[PDB]
Ligand binder design. Structure first.
Ligand SMILES: CC[C@H](C)[C@H](NC(=O)OC)C(=O)N[C@@H](Cc1ccccc1)[C@@H](O)C[C@H](Cc1ccccc1)NC(=O)O[C@H]1CO[C@H]2OCC[C@H]21
Lengths: 99, 99
């Protein structure tokens, strides 16, 4: 679809069998989701933005469906204020910025 | 144009007559630039991000050109790690997400 930017570009995603709302974020290298207990091994990671760094759990080869488009990649889990879909997954659904 | 997300969507902007590189960021409500000397009056403000809050200088009704597209709106100046063009200006240049 086409998503305008008058409001936060929030969409429904499916991950680990759950539905969630997430921000499509071209300014994020990586995908970061609110605390959830996902099965599997994980690696510790630090990610930063405005204001500093937070500690997260890195899960690899996680499937996520974003408005019916499927993507598979690394998903980070930690105390973020909002679920963020980053470029590592946006590229897989064919997402572009246009103006 | 149409911009893919395999790399960071960095573009050249012109503000206060100076050229800079900035990230087109659908995940930012507001535009935030690294320290610069901008003409005009300003008011202190705080904005938050993934790591917490930073102190910024809010400049209103600033002219900025983003790959030749003109916008006039609020620009925050402060210790951000990267120059970010947020939705308040992306909307003025007609930017949408498409997939
Ligand atoms: C991938 C890890 C991080 C998510 C990612 N870092 C990364 O990719 O570094 C490599 C990252 O922080 N990206 C941000 C831009 C950015 C800043 C610093 C360095 C690199 C890129 C932005 O795209 C997402 C962020 C999401 C958000 C967080 C908290 C509350 C609401 C929304 N928005 C945001 O901070 O916005 C500010 C500015 O406007 C205001 O509205 C929203 C809050 C205010």
């Amino acid at each position: 679809p086409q998503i305008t930017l008058w409001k936060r570009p929030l969409v429904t995603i499916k991950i680990g069998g759950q539905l969630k709302e997430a921000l499509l974020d071209t300014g994020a290298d990586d995908t970061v989701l609110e605390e959830m207990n996902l099965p599997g091994r994980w690696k510790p990671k630090m990610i930063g933005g405005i204001g500093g760094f937070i500690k997260v759990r890195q899960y690899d080869q996680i499937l996520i469906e974003i408005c019916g488009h499927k993507a598979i990649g690394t998903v980070l889990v930690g105390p973020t204020p909002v679920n963020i879909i980053g470029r590592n997954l946006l590229t897989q659904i064919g997402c572009t910025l246009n103006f």
